[PDB]
Amino acid sequence: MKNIAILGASGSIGQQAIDVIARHPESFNLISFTVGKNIEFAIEVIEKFKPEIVSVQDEADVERLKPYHSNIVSGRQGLIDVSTYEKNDLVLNALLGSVGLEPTMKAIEAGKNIALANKETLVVAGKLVMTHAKRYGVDILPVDSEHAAIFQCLNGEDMHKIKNVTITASGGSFRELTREQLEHVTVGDALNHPNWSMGNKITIDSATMMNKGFEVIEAKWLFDLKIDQIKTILHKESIIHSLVEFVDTSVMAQLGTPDMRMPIQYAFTYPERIEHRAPSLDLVQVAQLHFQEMDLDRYRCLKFAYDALRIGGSMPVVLNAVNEVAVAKFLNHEITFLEIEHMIEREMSAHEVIPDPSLEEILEIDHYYKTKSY
Amino acid sequence: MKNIAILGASGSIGQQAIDVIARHPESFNLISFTVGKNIEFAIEVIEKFKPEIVSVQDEADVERLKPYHSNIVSGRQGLIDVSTYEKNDLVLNALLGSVGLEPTMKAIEAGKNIALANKETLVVAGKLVMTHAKRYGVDILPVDSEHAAIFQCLNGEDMHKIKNVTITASGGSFRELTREQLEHVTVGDALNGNKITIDSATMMNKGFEVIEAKWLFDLKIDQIKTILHKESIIHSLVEFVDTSVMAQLGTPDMRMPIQYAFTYPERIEHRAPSLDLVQVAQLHFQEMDLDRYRCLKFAYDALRIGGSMPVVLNAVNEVAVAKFLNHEITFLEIEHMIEREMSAHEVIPDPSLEEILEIDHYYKTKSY
C-alpha cells in the first residue's frame, strides 16, 4: 500500500490519477495533493480520500478548506510542503508551466520517486533534474504515452546495450496537406471553435510536430541517450508508441490504443503491473500499420528541437518559451501558421547560450522570452 | 565465460552453434559434445576447440578417437554423461527425435540450463520438462524466433501478469492458394531439413510452437493466440493484465536465435542489417483461418485433450510428411492422416517418459 502525492490534482491528468487511486484502494492511498483555485474539487477529494495535507494557490482560499481539514497550506511553499511530505512514496507532478520545477527538485532531495506529467520539467531543465535524481537515488517515471512505451521496452534491459530509440508520430492535424496548403491554413482549420474543447495548445504542437520535438528532448535526458540514438518515424495509426533497437539488432516495441490511464497506473505500480479493465488492442481489426520517413523540411519544429539538443545549455528553454508565445499568438489570430516556426527560429538564432544554467537562470530566461516584445 | 554442451553437433544446427562459439571465444567455451557416426567431423571439432568429453553413437568408433582423445563415452549413456557433465553451463539439445528426451531430463536434474533446437522435446513432453525445470530452477529456451520474441517481451516482467501471448504466422508458401488449389500441390512446389520445410507450408510448425508456449509460459489454452502476419516482422506479442502490449520485431532470420539462446538473458552485438520500417512501409494482420490451416487446429485439439495426444500429433505428422515427400500421398492427405490417427487414439492421462517413447515409436513404426 503506497502513498501517492498529486501536484495539480484538478487538471486533466491529476483527475485521471485520482480515478486510478479510487479504482485500487487496495494498493494506493492519496496522502497529499494540491490544486490551484478549484476549491470545490479539493473539497470532494478531501471527503472521499482523506489526505493528510492539502495545498492551494491562494492564501485567501485556505479559510474555505479549514472546516474540512486540519492541515492546509498555500502558495509556492505549500507545493513544497506537499511534494516533500515525508509520508509520500511517489510524487505525481502534474503541474503545468515552470511552477512545477522547484517542487520536483525539493521532492528529489527528500528522496521521493517522481512521476512526471509535466513536459516543461525535462525540456527546460532535463540535465538539472536527472543529475539530481541520480545523486539522490530516485526514479523519474514518465506518465506520457511514448516515454511510458520506451520505459517498458527497457525494463529488464541494460541501457548500455541500446542501439537507438524511435518515437512514433501521427503527423498531426495537417499531415494530409501539401507544404503549400500549409501557407494558407487558419487556426480555424485546426480548431473549429477554440472554446469547445480542451487541449488547444497541444493540438497546435501536434500539427507543428513541436510535441514530438519536446518528447525527443525529454527522452534524451530521461534515458541518458546520445543525440544520434534518438529517432522518429511517422506512424499514421499511433498503435506502436515507440521502438527500441538493441545492439543485437533486436527491436522491442510497445503497442496499444490511447488510454491515458494506463501509463499513469503503470507509473504508480512500477515495476509491478496490476489489472486494468479496458478493451484489448485488436490488430486484426486494425488490419494495417503504416510507416514513412520523418520529413524535417516539412516539420521544421522537430528540426529545431534537435538543434536545441545539439547546442544544449539554455537553448531548449528558449525553444519552449518562444513556442508557447507563438502558439498563443496563433490561437488569437495574429500570425499565420507558418509564422510559428519563423518566430521560433529567429529567437533561437539570436539567443546567447548560457552554460549549464542554474535553476534560477532557467526561470529568468523562461520569463524573459515569455514577456519580451515581438 | 559460459561452458556450452552440444548434443548433435554434426548437423546444420550443431555447425551453427559451433560458429557462434568460434566467433565469441571470450563469451563461450565448447566444453562437451555429441556426434552420432560422423567421426571425421568430431575429430576436427576436437582439433579446434578443446572439448573435455565427447560421445559417439557406436561403442565401436571409440577406438579411432582415443589417439585424438578427449575423454570418450558412447551410446545412450554417453549422451547422459555429456548432458549432465558437471562443468556444463548450458546444453544445446540438437538431437533429432526422441533420443534427446532422456538426456535433457537428467541435465535438468543436474541443475543445467537447456537450449532446445527441436520442437519435439516440449511438444511430446512439455508437462514433464517444465515441472522438472521448475523444481530445479533451470532455464528452458527453445531456439526459435517466436519463443525468442516472447522471452524478450518478458524481460523484467512477471510471467503471472501475462494476459495473452500472440504468435504470428506468415501463412506459409501456399498462403495465397485456396483450399481447392491445394489439391494440385506437388513436392517441388512445396520445397521452396525437408520435413521442417513442409511443416511451414502446412502450418504444423506454428502448431508445435503453440504447444511449446503453453507449457513454457504455463498458460491456459485461451491465453495462447495466433494471427496471420504476411510480412513476418512482428514475431510475437505479449499482452499483460494492464492491457499494455509488448512486441519483438525484426527482419525474418535464423542466425540470431542460437546466439540469443547462448547469451540469454544478456544481449551482445550482432552485425546484420537493421530493421527499416520506412522501407517495409506496411504491416498487415488478419484473423487466423483454422479451416484453411487445419494442422494448427489439430495442435489446439491436442492441447485441450492433453496427455499423450500431442505425442500422437507429432509422430503421425512425421510419418505423413515423409510419405508426402516420397509421393505416396497428396499434400492434402497429410492433414487427413493426422486427423484419423488422432480420432482413433486412446489417450494416456499423465504418461511417464517411457510411455511417451513407446507411443512415439508405435506411431512412427506401425503401418498405415
Distant-in-sequence contacts of A305-311, Cβ < 8 A, 24+ apart: A305/A210, A305/A212, A305/A213, A305/A214, A305/A216, A305/A217, A306/A213, A306/A216, A306/A227, A307/A348, A308/A217, A308/A348, A309/A216, A309/A217, A309/A220, A309/A227, A310/A227, A311/A353
Which of A150, A243, A245, A249 would you mutate first to test chain B, the one with the most B CBs within 10 A? Answer: A249
Give the per-residue SS3 of chain B.
CEEEEEECCCCHHHHHHHHHHHHCCCCEEEEEEECCCCHHHHHHHHHHHCCCEEEECCCCCCHHHCCCCCEEEEHHHHHHHHHCCCCCCEEEECCCCHHHHHHHHHHHHCCCEEEECCCHHHHHHHHHHHHHHHHHCCCEEECCHHHHHHHHHCCCCCHHHEEEEEEEECCCCCCCCCCCHHHHCCHHHHCCCHHHHHHHHHCHHHHHHHHHHHHHCCCCHHHEEEEECCCCCEEEEEEECCCCEEEEECCCCCHHHHHHHHHCCCCCCCCCCCCCHHHHCEEECECCCCCCCHHHHHHHHHHHHCCCHHHHHHHHHHHHHHHHHCCCCCHHHHHHHHHHHHHHCCCCCCCCHHHHHHHHHHHHHCCC
Q: A296-374, what's its fold?
A: Rna Polymerase Sigma Factor; Chain: A (1.10.1740)
Closest chain A residue to B228, measured at CA: A284
∠ CA B192-B197-B202, rounded to 5°: 100
Q: Is A163 helix (H, G, I), strand (E, B) or coil?
A: strand
Distance of CA A327 to the CA centre of its chain: 17
A252 CA to chain B: closest CA distance, Å?
5
Q: Choose among A222, A81, A96, A249: nearest CA to A161.
A: A249
> What is d(CA A57, CA A62) in angstroms, rounded to the nearest whole number?
9
- The HSE-up count of residue B143 (CA atoms within 13 Å, CB side) is 26
Q: Which CATH superfamily is domain A1-144 in?
A: NAD(P)-binding Rossmann-like Domain (3.40.50.720)
Residue linked to cell 562443468: B87
Pairing of strands A140-142, A162-169: unpaired
> What is d(CA A137, CA A130) in angstroms, rounded to the nearest whole number?
10
Q: B290-368, what's its fold?
A: Rna Polymerase Sigma Factor; Chain: A (1.10.1740)
Q: Where in chain A is the domain with CATH 1.10.1740.10?
A: 296-374
Do residues B85 and B4 touch, judged by C-beta distance below 8 A?
no
Q: Is A278 helix (H, G, I), strand (E, B) or coil?
A: coil
Beta carbons of A290 and B275 less than 8 Å apart: no
Q: Where in chain B is the domain with CATH 1.10.1740.10?
A: 290-368
Copy the grid coordinates of residue A25: 484502494
> What is d(CA A54, CA A65) in angstroms, rounded to the nearest whole number?
9
State which amino acid sits at residue A54: V
A139 CA to chain B: closest CA distance, Å?
16
Residue A242: φ, ψ to 5°? -165, 160
Beta carbons of B278 and A291 less than 8 Å apart: yes
Instruction: Determine whether A76 is exposed, middle or buried from the number of CB atoms within 10 Å of its CB (0-12, 13-18, 19+).
Output: exposed
Closest chain A residue to B239, measured at CA: A280
Alpha carbon distances (Å) from B18 to B11, B96, B172 = 11, 17, 30
Do residues B247 and A241 touch, judged by C-beta distance below 8 A?
no
Q: Is A6 helix (H, G, I), strand (E, B) or coil?
A: strand
Q: At what angle do helices B39-49 and B12-23 cross, to 10 degrees?
A: 10
Q: Which residues, at least 6 apart from B244, have a Cβ–Cβ distance to it below 8 Å? A: A152, A254, A256, A262, A266, A273
CB pairs under 8 A between A and B: 139
How far apart are the two ends of chain B, measured CA to CA in Å?
A: 50
Closest chain A residue to B226, measured at CA: A284
Pairing of strands A240-246, A162-169: antiparallel
Alpha carbon distances (Å) from A287 to A144, A237, B104, B283 = 26, 11, 41, 8
Beta carbons of A272 and B158 less than 8 Å apart: yes
Closest chain A residue to B272, measured at CA: A249
Q: Return the DSSP state at A34.
A: E
Residue A249: φ, ψ to 5°? 70, 5
Instruction: Determine whether A63 is exposed, middle or buried from the number of CB atoms within 10 Å of its CB (0-12, 13-18, 19+).
Output: exposed
- Residue B166's DSSP bridge partners are B225, B237
Distance of CA A313 to the CA centre of its chain: 20
> What is d(CA A99, CA A129) in angstroms, rounded to the nearest whole number?
14
> What is d(CA A281, CA B238) in angstroms, rounded to the nearest whole number?
11
> What is d(CA A319, CA A311) in angstroms, rounded to the nearest whole number?
12
Q: Which residues, at least 6 apart from A269, have a Cβ–Cβ distance to it below 8 Å? A: A27, B242
Beta carbons of A249 and B274 less than 8 Å apart: yes
Pairing of strands B162-169, B234-240: antiparallel
Measured in residues, chain B has a length of 368
B269 CA to chain A: closest CA distance, Å?
5
Q: Where in chain A is the domain with CATH 3.40.50.720?
A: 1-144
Q: Which residues, at least 6 apart from A286, have a Cβ–Cβ distance to it below 8 Å? A: A237, A239, B285
Beta carbons of B277 and A249 less than 8 Å apart: no
Order the strands of the A2-7 sheet from edge to edge: A72-74, A53-56, A28-34, A2-7, A90-93, A113-116, A140-142
State which amino acid sits at residue B41: F
Copy the grid coordinates of residue A210: 513541436
Beta carbons of A256 and B244 less than 8 Å apart: yes
Cis ω before B252 (30° cut-off from 0): no
Closest chain B residue to A263, measured at CA: B244
Distance of CA A137 to the CA centre of its chain: 22
A275 contact residues in B (CB cutoff 8 A): 241-242
Beta carbons of B278 and A255 less than 8 Å apart: no
> What is d(CA A52, CA A89) in angstroms, rounded to the nearest whole number?
13
B244 CA to chain A: closest CA distance, Å?
6
Beta carbons of A290 and B282 less than 8 Å apart: yes
